[model samples]
Target: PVERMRMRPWLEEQINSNTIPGLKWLNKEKKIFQIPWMHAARHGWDVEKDAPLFRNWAIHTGKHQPGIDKPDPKTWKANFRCAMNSLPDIEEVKDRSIKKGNNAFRVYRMLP
Candidate 1:
């Protein structure tokens, strides 16, 4: 609870000021195409696989453009990559599950 209280103001500052890269993308691009870097890091949201889902979640939940949409696949990948690059210490957690499709998908975690 104490940690949550401390983090809330920081997150509110990021959202209010539009400093975080993913929220900046939402602001400048006028579309929801990627997950916020905070969620990617702190909440374990996957960048590639969860991009569209986050987009929809934001739009549907009234936090962002309610009717706005992702333009295209190429654009989607580009935007997602840009936002993912903003998170701190973005590296693979190698011990998870070295499987085929799962490995690439799991290659990122919150910095400790």
Candidate 2:
């Protein structure tokens, strides 16, 4: 697409404007292949959680690692609360589920 080729032109303009330098060397063709997806859908991740992390990491390393904020407090907190509240049901199901797989299903159908 036309937008793709704009990468080089944009960098050239940045260099010309003194807004940036070494952009030609900074920009390479095969480096495009090294770029990872912001999120891999296989893990149920999407841009909602991944894009901001990517941008933050790119802009600020202090908040990128070790101190990065979680993307979903609701899901994380709810999971923790569910684990705490469902301990009894989880144990009951664990004993009744017949063997050890599918704990999620047990947790999903746990008695409230």
Candidate 3:
């Protein structure tokens, strides 16, 4: 009980933060950290595969318009990379590959 009490304030802050900004606003375009956390909390990311994930996430959640109005693919990858730089539970890997017709790609995987 004491442990829970000790953690209560931080937990309350989390709840308040979510509401104060709200999930919808957090998921807005160019609002990188929000959707990245949303995605990371559920699964890992791939430069090519998940490039459209954020835009689609916002659209599907009713937070934004569909198609080109969403964050561009390049923007999405860059934002994901930016978030990964600070996230301790995620591992970032760079590899050279011709599979995607590019010299390299990034993989962001959530640690177990």
Candidate 4:
């Protein structure tokens, strides 16, 4: 029985509140949902084996206007991963990118 990684708790909080300070936006493909799951991947959540467990937890806990319902028992792993993505950190990447500037950045005036 494979278990959800130790980071599951942290990841859940980020998703539950939809806030991850360590997260970024936009993959090379110009999408913006893969990165969140990618972060979980880094923490050891694979698409097939692992995401199923996460989705179970997701559907049950966060579905009240929050996460799932396609299946009482779901297997939306890869597409589940598809449901989360994003990134950044390049000149051309940052060129016309909105970034956190008005929404994510420029908050340092308050942070500092």
Worst 10 residues of 2 by lDDT: 30-39
Alpha-carbon local distance difference test for all models: 0.37, 0.29, 0.36, 0.33
Every model's TM-score: 0.31, 0.17, 0.30, 0.22
lDDT of 3 by residue, 3-99 (tens): 2222223223333355323222222232212212333323334433343444443443333445646544444434444545654644444444544
**How does candidate 4 fare on TM-score?**
0.22
Sort the candidates on TM-score, descending order: 1, 3, 4, 2
lDDT of 4 by residue, 1-112 (tens): 3344433343334433444433333332432221223322433444333343445544434432233335432334443332223112122222245562532221100000
Q: Name the top TM-score candidate.
A: 1
**TM-score of model number 2:** 0.17
* Regions more than 4 Å wrong, model 2: 1-78, 81-92, 101-104, 107-112
| Model 4 spans with C-alpha error above 4 angstroms | 1-9, 12-48, 51-54, 60-75, 87-112
Give per-residue CA lDDT, model 2, range 33-84, as digits (tens): 0111222332335533333323333223222233464454234323333333
Which residue pairs collide, candidate 2? none
Tens digits of per-residue lDDT for model 1 on 10-92?
Answer: 33344446543444223322322222332233333345444543443333333344346433433433444453456453443
Candidate number with the higher lDDT (2 or 4):
4
**Deviation from native of the Cα of residue 23 in model 3, angstroms:** 26
